[PDB]
Design a protein around this ligand. Structure first.
Ligand code: 07F
Length: 273
């Protein structure tokens, strides 16, 4: 069974999730939409792997739908929108952290350092919960983002680590509690740059990990869920690698075509000079 401390820990994480995860995206509005040297550009074409169409269902019953263009200087038409969605998600993640007592008690410098290290990872973890793996679409209330079908199909889509990560994590069919513990483990990473209380964060991380392992042991006896704890930890390590690569991806794009919002600039360390 879970201890009283472990049950309290999960409850506080679920409470935070409940309060700060707008699962229907109802307060996401007033966002931008697409209109109605050489080596750096070629690497920036990295964007092709993440191609998505966009659907917006109106409250009145109307449906707007956007198919993006082929590559060739207009592969940036969707960046402002994605910047606005990412920003909206980041705010939710920041609120999540701030309502957790284990995070509130850390020094303000470590709070910021932990948020800059983990914001992308937490975003992806929340996005996985609205991912429909059958249709390859993220369902964000009135908005939907659907992967565009390419020559290799389902196989070729899994070559992009981000996309493969979303498919693999969804296949584990995790509970809400397991997702929120993944968020905690990722948030409380003692080895992010600029962390001062490395011992406290490490100990906290271990308690979340132990709580997740015990939750799984107590609630998932089936042969399918053997090694689930270790599969989850391997996915978080993978996600951290995806984070570092996609961070460099976004910074390269930002160098050629500015798109990052002020909040994104904060989290990515862009000063404005
Ligand atoms: C598929 C995907 N891809 C990217 C992503 C896109 C371009 C470059 C990257 F390096 C990327 O990682 N991003 C990152 C967020 C982003 C921030 C700034 C600008 C564009 C996007 C994602 O989160 C997702 C998941 C998702 C799917 C559908 C709706 C929302 C999210």
């Amino acid at each position: 069974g879970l201890t009283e401390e472990q049950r309290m820990m999960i409850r506080e994480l679920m409470d935070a999730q409940m309060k700060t995860f707008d699962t229907t995206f109802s307060h996401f509005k007033n966002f931008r939409l697409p209109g109605v040297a050489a080596k750096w550009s070629q690497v920036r074409k990295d964007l092709c792997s993440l191609k998505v169409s966009l659907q917006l269902r109106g409250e009145d019953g109307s449906v707007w739908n956007y198919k993006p263009p082929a590559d060739s200087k207009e592969i940036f038409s969707l960046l402002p929108h994605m910047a606005d969605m990412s920003t909206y998600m980041f705010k939710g993640i920041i609120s999540f952290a701030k309502v957790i007592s284990y995070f509130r008690d850390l020094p303000i410098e470590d709070q910021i350092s932990l948020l800059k290290g983990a914001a992308f990872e937490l975003c992806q973890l929340r996005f996985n919960t609205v991912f429909n793996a059958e249709t390859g679409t993220w369902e964000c209330g009135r908005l939907s983002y659907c992967l565009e079908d390419t020559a290799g199909g389902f196989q070729q889509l899994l070559l992009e680590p981000m996309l493969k990560f979303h498919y693999m994590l969804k296949k584990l069919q995790l509970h809400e509690e397991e997702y929120v513990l993944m968020q905690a483990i990722s948030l409380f990473s003692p080895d992010r740059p600029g962390v001062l209380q490395h011992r406290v964060v490490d100990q906290l991380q271990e308690q979340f990990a132990i709580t997740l392992k015990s939750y799984i042991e107590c609630n998932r006896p089936q042969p399918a869920h053997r090694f689930l704890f270790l599969k989850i930890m391997a996915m978080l390590t993978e996600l951290r690698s995806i984070n570092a690569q996609h961070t460099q991806r976004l910074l390269r794009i930002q160098d050629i075509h500015p798109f990052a919002t002020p909040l994104m600039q904060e989290l990515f360390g862009i000063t404005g000079s």
